Amino acid sequence: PFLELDTNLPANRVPAGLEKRLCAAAASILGKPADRVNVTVRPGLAMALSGSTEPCAQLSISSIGVVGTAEDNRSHSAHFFEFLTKELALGQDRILIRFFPLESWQIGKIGTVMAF
Amino acid sequence: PFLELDTNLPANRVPAGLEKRLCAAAASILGKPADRVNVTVRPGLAMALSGSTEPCAQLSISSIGVVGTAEDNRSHSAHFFEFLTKELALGQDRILIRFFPLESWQIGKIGTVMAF
Amino acid sequence: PFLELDTNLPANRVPAGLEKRLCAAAASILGKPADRVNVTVRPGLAMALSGSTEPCAQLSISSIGVVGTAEDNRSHSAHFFEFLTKELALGQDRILIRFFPLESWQIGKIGTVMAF
Ligand SMILES: O=C(O)c1cccc(-c2cc(C(=O)O)ncc2C(=O)O)c1
Ligand SMILES: O=C(O)c1cccc(-c2cc(C(=O)O)ncc2C(=O)O)c1
Numbered sequence: 121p122f123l124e125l126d127t128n129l130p131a132n133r134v135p136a137g138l139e140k141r142l143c144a145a146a147a148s149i150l151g152k153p154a155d156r157v158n159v160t161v162r163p164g165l166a167m168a169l170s171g172s173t174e175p176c177a178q179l180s181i182s183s184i185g186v187v188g189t190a191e192d193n194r195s196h197s198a199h200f201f202e203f204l205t206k207e208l209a210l211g212q213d214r215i216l217i218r219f220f221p222l223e224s225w226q227i228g229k230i231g232t233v234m235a236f
Numbered sequence: 237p238f239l240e241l242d243t244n245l246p247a248n249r250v251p252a253g254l255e256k257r258l259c260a261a262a263a264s265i266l267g268k269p270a271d272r273v274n275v276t277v278r279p280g281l282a283m284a285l286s287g288s289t290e291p292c293a294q295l296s297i298s299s300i301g302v303v304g305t306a307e308d309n310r311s312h313s314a315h316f317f318e319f320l321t322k323e324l325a326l327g328q329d330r331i332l333i334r335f336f337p338l339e340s341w342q343i344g345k346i347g348t349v350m351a352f
Numbered sequence: 353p354f355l356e357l358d359t360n361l362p363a364n365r366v367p368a369g370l371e372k373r374l375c376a377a378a379a380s381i382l383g384k385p386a387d388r389v390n391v392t393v394r395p396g397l398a399m400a401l402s403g404s405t406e407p408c409a410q411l412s413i414s415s416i417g418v419v420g421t422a423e424d425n426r427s428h429s430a431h432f433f434e435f436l437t438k439e440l441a442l443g444q445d446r447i448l449i450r451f452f453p454l455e456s457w458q459i460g461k462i463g464t465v466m467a468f
């Protein structure tokens with residue numbers, strides 16, 4: 121899976137090791153092995169969420185097969201909100217998630233595409 | 237709506253408050269309430285636009301229903317170019333926009349997905 | 353084409369001029385003119401790739417017509433991996449690419465959309 125987190129929290133207000141802990145949480149929540157989990161954290165950005173520049177975060181989650189229905193994404197959302205609200209000290213109104221299904225022909229890995 | 241702006245202008249050459257003013261402009265242009273507008277500004281990046289590393293900006297706009305046709309996006313583009321060229325002091329050849337339709341099952345909000 | 357590169361290498365470990373050289377390489381690999389090539393490099397991020405926080409990079413490539421099949425993307429992947437592994441001094445296991453087809457109605461250029 122690919123997780124991208126944008127936040128207006130400065131880097132020194134993002135807890136050390138968040139990218140590693142988010143990697144472990146995402147493996148458990150999405151049901152994918154941790155060695156296939158990718159996390160990108162981009163802190164110190166200028167952001168408005170729901171019209172407000174108060175501290176906030178945006179998460180994007182892309183994966184094959186497991187983020188393509190409302191029922192699957194409702195379950196994932198509950199767990200990712202629980203993890204991020206407590207790690208970043210943010211209220212549930214200061215985070216939004218976007219889910220993007222991917223297919224195997226879109227992923228370049230070790231110099232090829234493995235669309236088995 | 238979700239707006240993401242990447243620029244190679246350093247943070248101290250991006251006008252203070254741009255994220256707030258872009259939030260208000262996007263509400264008016266896209267016809268969505270300001271409390272549903274999200275803006276992310278990522279300055280100080282290394283960028284080439286149209287093969288040139290001169291100052292530039294890339295905007296991505298994602299929304300339900302209103303960015304899915306050429307006719308709708310032509311109208312939005314005129315207004316967003318007018319706003320960004322004047323705020324960032326950039327020529328119209330130094331900005332590009334990408335439009336991405338979203339559906340309600342892709343948005344995680346307050347720990348769930350509200351696909352009514 | 354639009355290329356976005358995220359890396360946890362600090363800016364001072366990314367070779368000067370990478371965005372310009374990636375622009376020239378992408379024109380040759382994708383078969384598009386260099387004056388239509390866009391590159392965004394975002395260094396100094398916190399990242400885990402395949403569960404590891406060792407140096408890594410993520411590349412996203414978006415274009416009309418030429419990134420929409422496994423056969424086309426397999427060819428592109430070989431060349432982009434060769435270029436990035438050697439420029440960034442990274443092993444082939446520390447880079448991943450995602451490919452995204454675009455259509456002409458999604459691109460705002462000079463204040464309009466040119467969907468001919
Ligand atoms: O099993 C596959 O078809 C395959 C091929 C290339 C990449 C991946 C893959 C998929 C996911 C995902 O579904 O979230 N995440 C990471 C990878 C990867 O192996 O790097 C899966
Ligand atoms: O009304 C909906 O179905 C719904 C459900 C969850 C989120 C949103 C929403 C939509 C947009 C958009 O169309 O640009 N932007 C923001 C939101 C949101 O409420 O946060 C809309």
Ligand SMILES: O=C(O)c1cccc(-c2cc(C(=O)O)ncc2C(=O)O)c1
Pocket residue numbers: 332353354384388389414415416417456459461466467468
């Ligand atoms: O020829 C087109 O239809 C057209 C219209 C507007 C933009 C572009 C374009 C396409 C690509 C791509 O296919 O990778 N990249 C850049 C552009 C652009 O001209 O800026 C192409």
